[PDB]
Design a protein around this ligand. Sequence first.
Ligand code: SF4
Ligand code: SF4
Ligand code: FES
Ligand code: FES
Ligand SMILES: [Fe+3]
Ligand SMILES: [Fe+3]
Lengths: 633, 633
Amino acid sequence: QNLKSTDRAVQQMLDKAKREGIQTVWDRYEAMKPQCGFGETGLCCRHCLQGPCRINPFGDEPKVGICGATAEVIVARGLDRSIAAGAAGHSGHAKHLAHTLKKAVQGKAASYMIKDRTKLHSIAKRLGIPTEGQKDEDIALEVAKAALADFHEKDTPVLWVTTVLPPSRVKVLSAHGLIPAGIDHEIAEIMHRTSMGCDADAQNLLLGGLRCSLADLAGCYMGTDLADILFGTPAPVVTESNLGVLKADAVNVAVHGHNPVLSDIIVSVSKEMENEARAAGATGINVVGICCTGNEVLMRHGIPACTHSVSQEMAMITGALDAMILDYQCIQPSVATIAECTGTTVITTMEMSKITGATHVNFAEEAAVENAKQILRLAIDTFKRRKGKPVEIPNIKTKVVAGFSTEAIINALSKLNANDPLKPLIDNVVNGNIRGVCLFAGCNNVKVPQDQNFTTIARKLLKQNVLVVATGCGAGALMRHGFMDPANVDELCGDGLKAVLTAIGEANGLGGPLPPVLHMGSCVDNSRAVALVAALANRLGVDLDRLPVVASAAEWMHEKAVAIGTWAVTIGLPTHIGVLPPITGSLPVTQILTSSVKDITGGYFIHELDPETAADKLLAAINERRAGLGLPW
Amino acid sequence: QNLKSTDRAVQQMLDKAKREGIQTVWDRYEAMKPQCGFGETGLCCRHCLQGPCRINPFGDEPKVGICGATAEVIVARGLDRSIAAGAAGHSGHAKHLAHTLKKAVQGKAASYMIKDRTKLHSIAKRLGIPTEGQKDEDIALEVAKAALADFHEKDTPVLWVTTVLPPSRVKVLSAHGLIPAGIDHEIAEIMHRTSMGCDADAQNLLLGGLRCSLADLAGCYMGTDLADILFGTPAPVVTESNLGVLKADAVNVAVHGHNPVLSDIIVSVSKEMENEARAAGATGINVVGICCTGNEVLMRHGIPACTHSVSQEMAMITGALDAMILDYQCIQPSVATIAECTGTTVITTMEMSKITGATHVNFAEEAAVENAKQILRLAIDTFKRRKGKPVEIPNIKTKVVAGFSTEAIINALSKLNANDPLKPLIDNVVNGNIRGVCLFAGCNNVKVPQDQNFTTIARKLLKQNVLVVATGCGAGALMRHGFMDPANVDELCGDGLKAVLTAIGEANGLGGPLPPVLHMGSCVDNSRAVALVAALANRLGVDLDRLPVVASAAEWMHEKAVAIGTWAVTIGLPTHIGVLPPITGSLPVTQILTSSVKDITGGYFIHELDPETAADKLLAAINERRAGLGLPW
Ligand code: SF4
Ligand code: SF4
Ligand code: FES
Ligand code: FES
Ligand SMILES: [Fe+3]
Ligand SMILES: [Fe+3]
C-alpha cells in the first residue's frame, strides 16, 4: 500500500477495503492503465462534432486537426478551458458568499452576520467604499454589491485584481492586456475563443489564459474576504489531523467540499444537539473536516481534519463515519456508492451539485439552522444503526497548529516590531536566516503516491531555511505528516529558520516555536499568501518577481489548481508543478509556459516530476532571486 | 468528389486542389480515420489531471472514471460544456453589438448609428423601457444597458428569454427551474458544475444544460435585435450564390465569420473605393459572403454568397480570392496556410481571434472606416499581384431570393389580411395547404457529404406541403442548390404549398411565388424563427409544443449548433439532428434527450443519420402535432 499512499492510516484502510472488496480510487486508476497518450499529451480535440481529432506526437498522420487546428492551437485551447473551469469554481464559491452576505445584512438570513467588523472596514477602504458615518450593514451591502459587480464588465476592471496586487505589477499586467474586465466575462470569452474556428494562435490563446487565471485569483481573494467577514478571520488554533480523529463512541460527521456557508453553521449547531446525540447513546457529535471545507472550519474553529483529496473514501471505510455532508468540488462521486457498503449517510446540499444515490437536503441560508438539525438528525439515526458493530479507526493522528491568516502572521511579527511588523521577516531574509518563502498548494493526485512530493520537497526546503506556507490539500498532506507540530521544529528545520520560528513563537508567549509549516487555509486562501507577499513586495519597494518567493503545486489535480498555478506564474512567481498537464504534445506551448512567459510576467512554470530534483530547482529559483537582490545565498 | 460534396462547384475545386497538392478539410478528415471511439461515444473525460479517463462502451474495464464518474455523468458533463461554449459564442457576438450600439449613441463611433428606429422602439417597449417623450439615443442607451445587464445576475431574469417566448412557455420553464439568471452566469455555472467532484447526477446536469441553452437563445435574440437596430431589419432581396459569384476581373473580397459589425462597414466603404480599384485595373470591388457574416450582408444588402462552412477553402482554390476578412467562429484555421499557395490575403480583425500566419488589422468601431480602407487596400494590392494569372472560377451559381425577417414575413402576409396578418398562414395550416413548418439550421459537417441531408430532407418536406424556413449554413446549402429561386416552386413544392407561396407572392405584386424556402438569416437569426412561431403560438392561444413546427440541424458541427438544437428542444420543438453528438455511450442520457425530456419541455431530439428516414420522422412529428390540434393530416 505504500506505493499508493505514504499515509499509514490510509494504508490501513486500503488493506480493509481490499479484504472487504470495496473498490477505491487507486483500483479505478489501475483499471484505467494504460491511459490514452493523446489525452495525456494534450493532442486531442473534441470541440466540434467533426471530431474527435487527435495528433500523433511523433510519426505519420494525423498531423493536424480536421479544421486545420495545429498541435500548438489544440494544446493551448485545452489548457485555456481548464483555466476557465477552475476560475468558474472559485468564483462560483465567492459569488455564493457574496449573495449570503447581502442576504444577511438585508435581514433575510439571521444565522449569518458580520462577525469581522475590522475586516469589513479594511476591505471597504481597499475598494474605495466610504466608511465614515456609514452603518455597518450599509458598508457590507456596498461591499457585497462591489463583489457581484466584479463578475461582469463595468467602468472599472476587476477590483479584486487591481486593488490586491502591487501597483507596479498591475502596470506590467495592464501593458500586456492581462487585467480581467469581469470574472464571468473572462470565463465566457475563453469558452468562445477556444470554440471551433476562433482563436488559432498559441501566444494569443495563452495570453487569454493568463488573464482568465487572474479572474480566478479575484474569485479566490473575494472568497477569502467574504468568508472572513461572515465567519471571522482565522487566528492561531491547535487541533489534530488524520483518521484517528474519528471517535467510535461519537456521531462522526464529516463536512466535505469547499464552501463553508453551511458547514460553519453545521459546526455551531452541532454543539447545541449534544444532549440529543447523548440520548441516542453517543458521547456527542464529533464534526471532522475533509478537503477545503474541512480546512475552513479547522482554521476558524479548530475542527480536526480527518483526511483530504485522493484518500477521502478511506474515512468511510473505517465504518465509523455516520454522515458526509457535501457542498461542491473535489468530492469523488464514488462516495455515494461506497456508502451502501459502509453505512455512511452521504448528503448533498447544493442545487447544482447532486450525486445519484445520495440523499439531498436543499440548504437555504434563510433556513440554515433548521437544515443543519435535519442533516444532523440523519447522522444521529445512522449512529444508532451501527450500535454494536466493529469499526476500524486507525489509531493514527498528528497535532496541528494552524490559523495563520495573513493578519495573524502580521500580528505575530508585530511582537518583534510593533510599528513595522514585516521588517523582522525581511531582516531575516536579508541576513540568510530565511532563505526564501515557498507556498505549497493544490491537490493530491492518484498518479503520485499520496503526499510523497509534498513531504519530500518540504523536508529539503526546511533544512535549507525556507519559510514554508501551505494551503488546501498541500496543507493537508503536510499536517498529516507532522509538519504543523512545533515539536518537530528541531528535526525538520535548518538552524536559521529554527531561530526565526523560535523568536517569533517566544515573543507570542508560546515558550516554543511556531510550527515548521504555516497553514494559511483553504484553496481560495491562496489569496492570503498573495496578500502576504504583496505586502512584503510593497514594503521592499519591488515587484513579486524580484522577491525570493516560489510556489509548488506538487501533486495537483483539479482545474482549480491549474488556474491557481497559472495565476501564480502571472503574478510573477516561479511555480513548480509535479504532474504534467496535457501540454507535452506541443513544444512551442511548453516553451512558453516554462521559459518565455518569464519575459511577460517574470514568473514561469517549473515542470519536475522527481521531487528531490524539484526541491533543488525551487532552491535554485529562490537563490537566483536572492542574487538579483544582491543578497548572499 | 461527389462522395465529399453534392455541390458541383465544390467538386470542381476539389479536383483543382488535388492536382495542385493542396490539402483540404476532406483530406484531413481522411487522415483522421478511424476516429477515436471513446470520443465519438462520449466516454472520455479530461476534466482533471488524473485523466484522461475513458469507459469501454461494452466489455470489461475500465467501466468508471478514476474519481467514480459514471458513463452517464461523463456524457452529460461533456454535453453541458458544449452547450456552454456555444452560448459563449452567440453571446460574445451579442455583447460586441451591445457595446457598439452604446458607443454609437454616445458619440464615440460615428460610422455606426440607429438605422432602424421602429425596431429600436418595439424592443424598448418589449423590455418595458419608456419611449414616450424620450430621445432616440437615450432609448438606445437604455436598450444597450439592458442587453449588457442580461449577462449577469440582477433583480430580473434574462429578459431576452422571458420577454420573447409565449407566457405559458415561460411558466413551464420557470416551474422546472430552467429560466437563466444571467447569460455569462449560466456559462460559468456549467463550467463549475461539470468540473471534477461537482455535479454527478445525469438528470440534474442535463437540466442545467437546458437552462444554459436558453442563455444561448437569449444571446441569439439579442444579437439579431441589436444588429437590426444598427444595420436595418432585412426585407426581401434578390442576389446569387456559389463560387460563380467571384469575378476574375474584380477585386474579390470575402467577408467571413459571424459578427457583421465590421463587414457591414466593409460593404458600404467598398462602394466608395470603386475608382481606386479601377486605377489598379479592376472593374471594381466585388464583396462576397462566406458563412454567417456573409448571410448578414446578404440579408441586408444582397451581397452574393460565395460558399459556406465545410467548403470555405474552395473559394481560395479558384485563385481569384484577393482577400478573406475574418472576424470569428467557424473559420477553418487552414485558410492561413492555404493562403500561401493561393495568393489570398487572409486578414484577422478581432483581438481574441487570431490565426498564426494571417495578417492582423486591429479593428475598432471608433476607426471603422479607416480600418476598412486599409483592409481593402491590402486586397487591391493582392489583385495587382495576380494580374495575368489564370484563375478557375466554376461557372456555377444560383439565384437567391432572401431577406425574410419575421417583420418581412408578417408584412408579406399582411397583404392577404391587413389587420390579422398571421391568420392567412394559420388558415392554410388548418385547411392543409401548409402541413407544418420546418426550420433547417446549423452547419455542414465533413462526416456528411456536403448538403446531402439538407437537400434530401427539404425535397421530401416541400413535396408534402411543409413551409420550410432556413438559417445559417442550412440556408447556405439550400440556396446553393436552387431552393431560394422562385422558378423552382413548380418542381419542388406540393400543390398546397405552391398555392400559398403563389397567393402571397402575387399579393406582394410579384407576378410569381415566394421562393420554395424562406431564408431567415444567420445563425443568431434562428431567433427570428422563434419570434415567428411564438407569434403564431400567441395568435392560436397555445404553446410551441402544440404547434406543427419542427427543426432539423441536419449536418451540424459547432458547439453553437449544439446550443441551438438544445434550446429548440427546450422551447418545445421536435428537433432532428443528422450527426450523433457524443452521447451514445450512455443509454440513460440518450433516453432523456430523445424521449423523457418530452415530459419536461414537450420537445425532443430526433436522432436519424439517414435523411430519407429523417424526413419521414419529421413528417410524423408534424402530423402528430396536427392530430393533437384536431386537424386532418
Ligand atoms: S475544432 Fe477542429 S480539431 Fe477540434 S474537433 Fe473540431 S475539427 Fe477537430
Ligand atoms: S474528473 Fe474523474 S473521470 Fe474526469 S479525468 Fe478526472 S478522475 Fe477522470
Ligand atoms: S483520443 Fe484519448 S483523449 Fe481523445
Ligand atoms: S480516449 Fe479518444 S477522445 Fe479521449
Ligand atoms: Fe481537497
Ligand atoms: Fe458557417
